[PDB]
Amino acid sequence: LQYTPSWMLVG
């Protein structure tokens, strides 16, 4: 399902 996206995981 909807894991958290690449962005948001950036930094």
């Epitope: 399902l1 909807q2 894991y3 958290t4 962005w7 948001m8 995981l9 930094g11």
Partner: antibody, heavy 120, light 113 residues
Framework: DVKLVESGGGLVKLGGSLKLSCAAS????????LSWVRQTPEKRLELVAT????????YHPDTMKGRFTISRDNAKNTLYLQMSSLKSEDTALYYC?????????????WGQGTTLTVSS | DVVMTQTPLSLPVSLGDPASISCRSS???????????LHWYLQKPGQSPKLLIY???NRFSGVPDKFSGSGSGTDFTLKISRVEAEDQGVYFC?????????FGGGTKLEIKR
């Protein structure tokens, strides 16, 4: 210190609209992601919206979608949240919130939050 | 999205005792990157939540060692070794593996009598 300050709450008629601000002092705004979270009068859960830095990317669950819209002014250390067709189920305490930079996906700094009541 | 179910909803205690709050997501929490984004927050009567533990079991800067967290995938546990008066409020587990992020109903530490 790191201090976010929510403001602009109050009473609004149903289907009304209102703009919450969140002012962010004591750090490099342009660096962090922020969100708005909220707490149901029965004291719950509540993610509303999230935005990147120099905000070209945003997320809104599907529910909030249409009623809520996040934005920022890195050029001004302020995040916002334009609300638009308020249902009464939107009444709640609105928190401003900072994401940890290590990307561990958790909020390290919350504000005191503004109250919002939707009633005619 | 995933239903964070905490247990019990209420917890009566005498200071000095110790406690365990469960939290159980619906889907699993291992993210497609090995990270398990389960956290724990405390809310004190009248304040903003404050993060205690992140990534299942990482203490946040300034969180006393009485606190500790553990678990895997769907099931998780918050443990407190000796409860202080300071430790009383509502505790919540959020997850971030799945968007949108969700938080549990919260769990209340309250005085036993």
């Amino acid at each position: 210190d790191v201090k976010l300050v929510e403001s602009g709450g109050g009473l609004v008629k149903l289907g009304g609209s209102l703009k919450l601000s969140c002012a962010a002092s004591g750090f490099t705004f342009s660096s962090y992601f922020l969100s708005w979270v909220r707490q149901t009068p029965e004291k719950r859960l509540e993610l509303v919206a999230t935005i990147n830095s120099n905000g070209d990317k945003t997320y809104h669950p599907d529910t909030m979608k249409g009623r809520f819209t996040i934005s920022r002014d890195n050029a001004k250390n302020t995040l916002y949240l334009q609300m638009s067709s308020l249902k009464s189920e939107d009444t709640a305490l609105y928190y401003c919130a900072r994401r940890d930079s290590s990307a561990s996906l958790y909020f390290d700094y919350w504000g005191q939050g503004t109250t919002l009541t939707v009633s005619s | 999205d995933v239903v964070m179910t905490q247990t019990p909803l209420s917890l009566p205690v005498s200071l000095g005792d110790p406690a365990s709050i469960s939290c159980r997501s619906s889907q699993s929490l291992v993210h497609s990157n090995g990270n398990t984004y389960l956290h724990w927050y405390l809310q004190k009567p009248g304040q903003s939540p404050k993060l205690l533990i992140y990534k299942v079991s990482n203490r946040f800067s300034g969180v006393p060692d009485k606190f500790s967290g553990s678990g895997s995938g769907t099931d998780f546990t918050l443990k407190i070794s000796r409860v202080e008066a300071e430790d009383q409020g509502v505790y919540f587990c959020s997850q971030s593996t799945h968007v949108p992020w969700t938080f549990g109903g919260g769990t209340k530490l309250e005085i036993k009598r």
